[PDB]
Amino acid sequence: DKRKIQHEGIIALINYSTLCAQKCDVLKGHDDKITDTEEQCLRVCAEKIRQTFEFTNDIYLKN
Amino acid sequence: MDPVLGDVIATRIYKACFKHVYGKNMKAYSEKDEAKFDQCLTSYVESYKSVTNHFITYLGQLPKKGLSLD
Amino acid sequence: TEVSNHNYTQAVAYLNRATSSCVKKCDSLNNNGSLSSKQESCLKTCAENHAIATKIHAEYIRKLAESKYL
Amino acid sequence: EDNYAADVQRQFNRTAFDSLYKICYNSLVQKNGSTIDFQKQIDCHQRLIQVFAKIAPIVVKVE
Amino acid sequence: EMILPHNNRQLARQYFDSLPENDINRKY
Amino acid sequence: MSTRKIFDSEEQSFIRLVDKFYLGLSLTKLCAQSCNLLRNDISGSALTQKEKDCLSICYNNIEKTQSAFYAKVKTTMNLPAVE
Amino acid sequence: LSLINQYKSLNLSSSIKHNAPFINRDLYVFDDLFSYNLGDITTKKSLFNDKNSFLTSYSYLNNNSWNNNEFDLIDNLPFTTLFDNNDLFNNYKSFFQDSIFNSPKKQLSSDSKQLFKHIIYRSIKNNIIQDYTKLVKHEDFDEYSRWIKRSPGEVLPLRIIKYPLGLETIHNNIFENTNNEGNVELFRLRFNSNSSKMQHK
Amino acid sequence: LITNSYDIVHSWFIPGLGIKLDCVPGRSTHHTFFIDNVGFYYGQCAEICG
Amino acid sequence: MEQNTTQVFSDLAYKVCFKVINDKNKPFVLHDEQRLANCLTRYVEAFNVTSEYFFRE
Amino acid sequence: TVVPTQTFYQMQDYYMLCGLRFERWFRCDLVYHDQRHTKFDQVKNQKNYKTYPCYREYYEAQYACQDDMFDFLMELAYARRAADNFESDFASHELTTLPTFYDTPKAAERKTYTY
Amino acid sequence: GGEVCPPMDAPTDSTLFVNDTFTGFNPDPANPEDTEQVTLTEITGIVRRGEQQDILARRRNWNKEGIYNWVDLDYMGKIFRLFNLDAINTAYIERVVPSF
Amino acid sequence: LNQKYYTHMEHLWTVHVNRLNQKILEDPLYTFYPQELNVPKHNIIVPTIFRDTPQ
Amino acid sequence: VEEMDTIQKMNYEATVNMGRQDLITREYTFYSDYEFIPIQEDRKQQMEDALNNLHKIIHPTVTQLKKKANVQEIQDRVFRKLQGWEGELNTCVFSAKNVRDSNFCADRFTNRINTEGVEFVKQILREY
Amino acid sequence: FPFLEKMKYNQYKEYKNDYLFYLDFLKKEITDDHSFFWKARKVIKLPQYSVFSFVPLKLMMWKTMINYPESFWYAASRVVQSRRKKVFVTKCSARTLTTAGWTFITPFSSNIKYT
Amino acid sequence: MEPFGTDERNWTHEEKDIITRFLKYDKHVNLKTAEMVYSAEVESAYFGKAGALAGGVISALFFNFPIVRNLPIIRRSVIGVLPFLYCYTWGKNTQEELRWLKTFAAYQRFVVYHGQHCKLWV
Ligand code: HEA
Ligand SMILES: [Cu+2]
Ligand SMILES: [Cu+2]
Ligand SMILES: [Mg+2]
């Protein structure tokens, strides 16, 4: 269903945002502001996730 | 609380107990593993009781309005 | 005075997550069927921390949702 | 329509697929993102698919 | 009012870096 | 332990199947970790003989004690019947 | 006049499918990839995620989860009995006397709506998840009440207060206050932790 | 005696003691009061009030 | 379902933030509550950044 | 006596004296109002019990004022304590007051002490 | 307050019994939130534009007397204290039954 | 026009040269960035849990 | 704390209730107020530690002075510097956007107290 | 005094300018429109009669009332024999309808609340 | 908040407009102040139109006045349009003055509401 597909897409967004936040060590308690270095790390993590998913989609469409 | 939630609880317990038995040594099955599973079940039940007691106690001792003491 | 079934289930879910996290943190399953004094102290501390964190997390989520209104 | 069981099975397959892929990505990604091998990701995903295919009849069942 | 150093965007520095090498501002 | 009639029979069965599905995913991750499947040294897309044997041991262990442990937890928790 | 080019796209589904970090959903492998015993499914069943939050959403959907219960009815916990433990029973009642742990369905629905609005707008920026109305909000406060008074300006984050000296001559001591180190205090720091609450009468 | 009045001016008038204290609104008037005998004295209001 | 999406969001927020904050298993203080709030804010902002990059740069 | 009655003693009616005493008590209270339940009379245990520093000024103000005027002044005190309005935040009239011998910069050395 | 059309049938998807994201309607016959209980009727019609005054065509309305001869969507929206006056003035839907 | 702004511009240029000589490439005090360069204010402020004072 | 007579129970209830005025009034918030990010608890403790360090230096001098006028003069001289620094801190904390900015301002204020405040206090006390 | 209250007819004032729903107003149940009903001032034990008329005896015939150019106070002025001669039952006109002596004393004189 | 004194700059048109749109739409402003600014906007608008229209009518009459009607076209036009210019200026000035006086009253109410004036407290 279209609603189910949208739900899965948003859940995937949440899961991989959490994964990038954990991998970049963004979550800290000393202050609530994410520095520009951490924002760059998060964006690079998101870019790598996007590239990996493009590769996987192409491979599975070929197969 | 629907009974299925209890079933859900069981699942978590099983998962935890599994990690305590075969988490490191992936051996075969015997009565020793059954005894270890029963030990883990009892430990998890006691830990759940303790956590429930302390959680509810702390969240109920937080003041929320004027003291009555009728 | 009146608690919904959903709110009771949410309380049970709070207890479930607190119990799982305190079992993992305090190694409460590494026993002979009964908890140790050190394990009991660690479970008490972890349960109190979970109570505080649950209160703060619920307040933060409600304040975010309400800030959408404001 | 009448394929309610088929729809539920399709949802289960999609969710398991995505969860296994996320597990492999979390396990394989290195250096706060920006470093992962696409072929290694695909191989891990296939191996985890085989493992879950063996596990699903054992665990995922009714009654 | 003062802008905090972490919230300070060095726009003056950005323009300074874009200047030619033989520039009066670089001489200053 | 306070039990109520909330979900229907089919809905209860589906929720049980859903938690079994997520338990299956968790056990998939568990057997993968315990059999050294998740490593960067792997350069192939197939399971080796040792990995297959360890996975078979994991499946056997899951098979032997799942129902028994669920029954034991159900007896220990002792949820009162819904009326 | 304001709607001329405000809403470019209306389909969230297309943007989700072409941009979300998930594998393509049209693959034919999702039909018989794995084998499960699903019993009989005579109704459209939907799956919920996170392996811990599915039951909360399943209970939220159901209408029988909103039947109010008295504590004497729900006087039990999954591994603990509360009818024989009076202290824990009272703490349990106090726990459920918090408005943040005992909310009506309307509060949870509003919170879920606003959180989903936040998620969609921060992810897609599609501008259709926001409220269509433009709300102008003004505070109407009854200033003619002596029981509650607001704070003109604010109670500032920090105030340094001089301790008065010589107000007491009972034993020829002009320092009313002394800290734990034993040193007499001349100044005090007062903080305003909550910037919006009223000041008690 | 701190004499005051809620609404209008009254007069606490004790004839036996020969004293009269004017209770005036907004005026907290301090009077000294000394009675040098055991006595039950009646009195009235000596300012027109209604 | 949208409520399920928000429930997953909130539960993941609490899980990750409490794992980070409660690291030494010491009893909490008031500043520990404030640090948990800071970690939750960082989680929300990290989600904003990552999702915004995912859809377009 | 902290605030003397002799400041306004020619007047039998104590209204300016009432205002003066209440103002002094309100200054003292603005210093100590939020520490009362932790360091002063309103502590839970008598171990940490201490008399509130403004007790004498409070009783003097109560003596000088009737309950009606005291209620008016308490309404003003609430209005000024909600906003945390210390009088020193607004006071400037000392710049438009005639100089006096008591206004010397060396206030401690102005007094001559003698046995 | 008559019944123009029979109320719409309840959906067969249990996840559709929540308030809609955009319309805000809950298709729940027994809604736990009493203040959010709505009954939805589904109509089909044709979009038509509003009318204008043409005195020579004998389409003139006296608002004060209550005599109306042409569809003045602006006045109709104002008199009924409706909210989206512009989206009311733009057009209106003429209900069309299928065959009879 | 030159008479009005000659001294004002001399002071501005002198300040510019002084802060370049001191190698100050940071923005001056009264610099008000546009909307995109500003820091959004964090709305979500959660007050700490109220607890009774032991003393 | 349970076992006590009626009078003791009433006194305990009174003492408890006199401390929950902050609890009761936290629900009544105003929409039109200008909110600010408050000073964090650790920064509050650091500022109070700096104040206690200042009080450590002044204690022997003020306790060895037998004139109230001298002690009041010492209090006034320090208070002007402290009030200027407090005004700077209040401005920079009210105009703060995140907790990082509030922490920066509180750290600047504490560093001013611990660096220049002690020097100024020592000079004053040497004068006295 | 029932003839004085013009709030009774306020519902008619709405449609003096808004004719639109005047016809809808006219199709309404008649309860007290252009009529005065006086509630029972006496206990009457007559089960045969459901409703009793307590109209004043000097207002029963409108033929005499319509052409008389005077207010309806003639129906209220000394029409009962019930007198009560008790010094303590004097319900005066109003407690505030007094004077403050030939020396106008304040705030007694300068306030409508008291005079 | 505004500087006070003889040497200070008077409120410019841009400042008045910005303050008006601040008081009308911003939060931190009570409902009464915003309603004051709204009532200022509603009632002031009549005077500009009224002045312009009265000036137009008077100028139409003045273009045919006993001496104006016999003037050359340039002088006749100038003398005829003088009443229109005067009344149009009167209408615009009255509208601006009424609106700004009420808006400045609302601004004073806002300043006292948030305690943003020294030497003013309850
Ligand atoms: C002009 C001054 C004047 C006069 C003449 C009178 C006349 C009288 N007064 Fe009056 N009285 C006052 C001045 C006066 N009074 C005042 C100021 C008050 C205060 C009011 C208040 O308290 O606020 C007062 C109040 C007052 C009270 C107060 C009631 C109360 O306090 O409870 C009483 C009661 O005993 C009283 C008694 C009398 C009596 C018995 C007479 C009798 O002597 C009456 C005698 C009658 C005459 C004197 C008539 C004169 C004869 C003529 C026909 C004149 C025409 C002749 C020629 C043209 C030459 N008076
Ligand atoms: Cu009297
Ligand atoms: Cu009297
Ligand atoms: Mg008198």
Binary contact (I7, G19; C-beta < 8 A): no
Task: Find the CB nearest C52 among I14, I17, I33.
Answer: I33
Which tokens go with O61?
Answer: 């009459």
- The C-alpha atoms of residue F66 and residue F62 are separated, in whole angstroms, by 6
Tell me which chain L residue has its CA closest to the CA of residue B65.
L50
Answer yes or no: is H36 a known binding residue. Answer: no
- The C-alpha atoms of residue M81 and residue M122 are separated, in whole angstroms, by 13
CB G179 within 8 A of CB M55: yes
Nearest Cα neighbor of C55 from G103, A28, L49, L51 is L49
Q: Is the dihedral of CA N75, N80, N86, N89 positive or negative?
A: negative
CB K77 within 8 A of CB K28: no
Query: In Å, what is the CA distance from G113 to each residue of A40, D4, F65, I2, I46?
Result: 30, 28, 43, 8, 21
Which tokens go with L42?
Answer: 């964090």
- The alpha carbon of H21 and the centre of ligand 3 are apart by a number of angstroms equal to 12
Chains that touch L (3 or more CB pairs under 8 A): B, C, E, G, I, J, M
CB C33 within 8 A of CB B43: yes
Q: Please, what's the b/e burial string for J2-19 (b: 16 or more CB within 10 A of its CB; e: otherwise)?
A: bbeeeebeeeebbbebbb
Binary contact (C64, L44; C-beta < 8 A): yes
Query: How many Cα atoms sit within 13 Å of N21 on the Cβ side?
Result: 7
> What dihedral angle (degrees, nearest 10) is formed by the CA atoms of H18, H24, H28, H33?
10
In 3-state terms, chain B is what percent helix, strand and coil (to 5)?
A: 70, 0, 30
- Closest chain K C-alpha to I2 CA, distance in angstroms: 8
Check pocket membership of N102 for ligand 1, CB cut-off 6 A. yes
Tell me which chain G residue has its CA closest to the CA of residue O120.
G152
Q: Which long-range contacts (CB under 8 A, 24 or more apart) does H13-16 make?
A: H13/H43, H13/H44, H13/H45, H13/H46, H14/H41, H14/H42, H14/H43, H15/H41, H15/H42, H15/H43, H15/H44, H16/H41, H16/H42, H16/H43
- What is the DSSP code (8-state) at residue C66? H
Query: In Å, what is the CA distance from O89 to each residue of G185, I52, O53, O99?
Result: 68, 54, 11, 15
> Residue M24: CB partners within 8 Å, gap ≥ 6?
B65, B66, G200
| Chain Cα centroid distance, residue H13 | 5
Q: Is the dihedral of CA G175, G180, G182, G185 positive or negative?
A: negative
- The C-alpha atoms of residue G189 and residue M87 are separated, in whole angstroms, by 13
Query: In Å, what is the CA distance from N60 to each residue of J29, N12, N72?
Result: 73, 25, 12
For L1-55, the DSSP string reads -HHHHHHHHHHHHHHHHHHHHTT--S--TT----TTTSPPP-----PPPP-----
Answer yes or no: is H31 a known binding residue. Answer: no
- The C-alpha atoms of residue A36 and residue N9 are separated, in whole angstroms, by 73
Nearest Cα neighbor of A20 from G124, F32, D22, I21 is D22
3-state secondary structure of G44: strand
- What is the DSSP code (8-state) at residue M115? I
Which tokens go with J13?
Answer: 């009616």
CB B18 within 8 A of CB F77: no
Query: In Å, what is the CA distance from J24 to each residue of F21, G100, J42?
Result: 73, 43, 21
CB D36 within 8 A of CB A20: no
Query: How many Cα atoms sit within 13 Å of L31 on the Cβ side?
Result: 17
Binary contact (M38, G139; C-beta < 8 A): no
Nearest Cα neighbor of D4 from O19, F53, G43, M94 is G43
3-state secondary structure of C4: coil
For B33-65, the DSSP string reads HHHHHHHHHHHHHHHHHHHHHHHHHHHHHS--S
Q: Which bound ligand lies closest to the C-alpha atom of N103?
A: 1
Which tokens go with J75?
Answer: 């309404």
Mutational pocket test of ligand 1: of N99, N102, N105, the residue with most ligand atoms within 8 Å of the beta carbon? N102
- What is the DSSP code (8-state) at residue M114? I
- The C-alpha atoms of residue B46 and residue B24 are separated, in whole angstroms, by 23
Nearest Cα neighbor of N57 from N74, N35, N71 is N74
Query: In Å, what is the CA distance from M110 to each residue of G74, M105, N26?
Result: 52, 9, 79
Q: Please, what's the b/e burial string for G62-76 (b: 16 or more CB within 10 A of its CB; e: otherwise)?
A: beebbeebebeebbb
Task: Find the CB nearest D51 among F13, F46, F55.
Answer: F55
Q: Which long-range contacts (CB under 8 A, 24 or more apart) does B14-18 make?
A: B14/F23, B14/F66, B14/F69, B14/F70, B14/F73, B15/F23, B15/F26, B15/F27, B15/F30, B16/B40, B16/B44, B16/C20, B16/C23, B16/C24, B16/C29, B17/B41, B17/B44, B17/C29, B17/F69, B18/F27, B18/F30, B18/F62
- The C-alpha atoms of residue J36 and residue J41 are separated, in whole angstroms, by 6
CB G74 within 8 A of CB C8: yes
Cis peptide bond prior to L28, omega within 30° of 0 = no
Which tokens go with K62?
Answer: 């006296």
Which tokens go with M37?
Answer: 């990010």
Answer yes or no: is J111 a known binding residue. Answer: yes
Task: Name the region of G109 (left: φ>0; alpha: ψ -120 to 50; beta: rest).
Answer: alpha
For F16-59, the DSSP string reads HHHHHHHHHHHHHHHHHHHTT-S-TT---SS--HHHHHHHHHHH
Check pocket membership of N99 for ligand 1, CB cut-off 6 A. no
Beta pairing class for H19-23 and H10-14: antiparallel
Which tokens go with I8?
Answer: 């997953």
- The C-alpha atoms of residue O109 and residue N104 are separated, in whole angstroms, by 40
Tell me which chain J residue has its CA closest to the CA of residue L54.
J44
Which of G143, G147, G173, G177 would you mutate first to test chain J, the one with the most J CBs within 10 A? G177
Q: Is D30 on the interface with A (CB under 8 A)?
A: no
Check pocket membership of N101 for ligand 1, CB cut-off 6 A. yes
Which tokens go with K93?
Answer: 């839907």
Question: Cα-atom radius of gyration of chain M, to the nearest Å?
Answer: 21
CB I53 within 8 A of CB A42: yes
* Single-letter code of the amino acid located at K75: Y
In 3-state terms, chain J is what percent helix, strand and coil (to 5)?
A: 60, 0, 40
Phi, psi of K88 (to 5 degrees): -85, -40
Query: In Å, what is the CA distance from M37 to each residue of G196, I34, L40, M61, N66?
Result: 11, 11, 13, 38, 77
| Chain Cα centroid distance, residue M55 | 12
- The alpha carbon of N104 and the centre of ligand 1 are apart by a number of angstroms equal to 18
> Residue K10: CB partners within 8 Å, gap ≥ 6?
K27, K28, K29
- The C-alpha atoms of residue D43 and residue D51 are separated, in whole angstroms, by 12
3-state secondary structure of G158: strand
Nearest Cα neighbor of F9 from H37, J109, G40, B12 is G40
Binary contact (G41, F26; C-beta < 8 A): no
Nearest Cα neighbor of O57 from O75, O93, O32, O84 is O84
Check pocket membership of N69 for ligand 1, CB cut-off 6 A. no
CB I25 within 8 A of CB C28: no
- The C-alpha atoms of residue N33 and residue N36 are separated, in whole angstroms, by 8
| Chain Cα centroid distance, residue J111 | 24
Check pocket membership of N62 for ligand 1, CB cut-off 6 A. no
- The alpha carbon of N90 and the centre of ligand 2 are apart by a number of angstroms equal to 19
Nearest Cα neighbor of I6 from A19, G50, G126, C9 is G50
- The C-alpha atoms of residue O52 and residue O65 are separated, in whole angstroms, by 20
CB count within 10 Å of CB J115 equals 2
- The C-alpha atoms of residue N56 and residue O100 are separated, in whole angstroms, by 61
The separation between the first and the last C-alpha atoms of chain H, rounded to the nearest angstrom, is: 24
Phi, psi of I20 (to 5 degrees): -70, -45
- The C-alpha atoms of residue C30 and residue C27 are separated, in whole angstroms, by 6
The separation between the first and the last C-alpha atoms of chain N, rounded to the nearest angstrom, is: 24
Which residues does residue M19 pair with via DSSP β-bridges, in sequence order?
Answer: none
- The alpha carbon of H10 and the centre of ligand 4 are apart by a number of angstroms equal to 8
Chains L and D are touching, with contact defined as 3 or more CB–CB pairs separated by less than 8 Å: no
- The C-alpha atoms of residue M68 and residue M74 are separated, in whole angstroms, by 10
CB O1 within 8 A of CB O116: yes
- The C-alpha atoms of residue O28 and residue O24 are separated, in whole angstroms, by 11
- The C-alpha atoms of residue B54 and residue C44 are separated, in whole angstroms, by 6
Q: Is G50 on the interface with A (CB under 8 A)?
A: yes
Query: In Å, what is the CA distance from G53 to each residue of B8, B19, G58, J3?
Result: 11, 22, 9, 67
CB D20 within 8 A of CB F18: no
CB I42 within 8 A of CB A28: yes
- What is the DSSP code (8-state) at residue G124? T
Residues in chain G within 8 Å Cβ distance of L47 = 193-194, 197
CB O23 within 8 A of CB O33: yes
Which tokens go with N40?
Answer: 């029972």
Which residues does residue H30 pair with via DSSP β-bridges, in sequence order?
Answer: H2
Nearest Cα neighbor of A9 from I2, K21, I17, G130 is I2
For D2-62, what is the HEC assignment? CCHHHHHHHHHHHHHHHHHHHHHHHHHCCCCCCCCCHHHHHHHHHHHHHHHHHHHHHHCCC
3-state secondary structure of K6: coil
- The C-alpha atoms of residue F31 and residue D27 are separated, in whole angstroms, by 14
CB G46 within 8 A of CB I4: no
- The alpha carbon of H11 and the centre of ligand 4 are apart by a number of angstroms equal to 7
| Chain Cα centroid distance, residue B31 | 23
Check chain D for breaks (C–N over 2.5 Å) and list the residue before each, or none. none
CA angle, L15 as apex, L11 and L17 as ends, to 5°? Answer: 115
For residue A44, what is the enclosing H or E element? helix A36-62
- Closest chain G C-alpha to J78 CA, distance in angstroms: 6
For chain H, what is the HEC assignment? CEECECCCCEEEEECCCCEEEEECECCCEECCCCCCCCCCCCCEECCCCC
Tell me which chain G residue has its CA closest to the CA of residue J84.
G155
- The C-alpha atoms of residue F25 and residue F27 are separated, in whole angstroms, by 5
Beta pairing class for H2-3 and H29-30: antiparallel
For I1-57, the DSSP string reads --HHHHHHHHHHHHHHHHHHH-SS-PPP-HHHHHHHHHHHHHHHHHHHHHHHHHH--
Residue N103 Cα: closest atom of ligand 1: 23
- What is the DSSP code (8-state) at residue O54? H
Which residues does residue K49 pair with via DSSP β-bridges, in sequence order?
Answer: K91
> Residue L49: CB partners within 8 Å, gap ≥ 6?
B62, C52, C55, C56, I30, I33
The separation between the first and the last C-alpha atoms of chain L, rounded to the nearest angstrom, is: 72
Binary contact (B67, M24; C-beta < 8 A): no
- The C-alpha atoms of residue J88 and residue J71 are separated, in whole angstroms, by 24
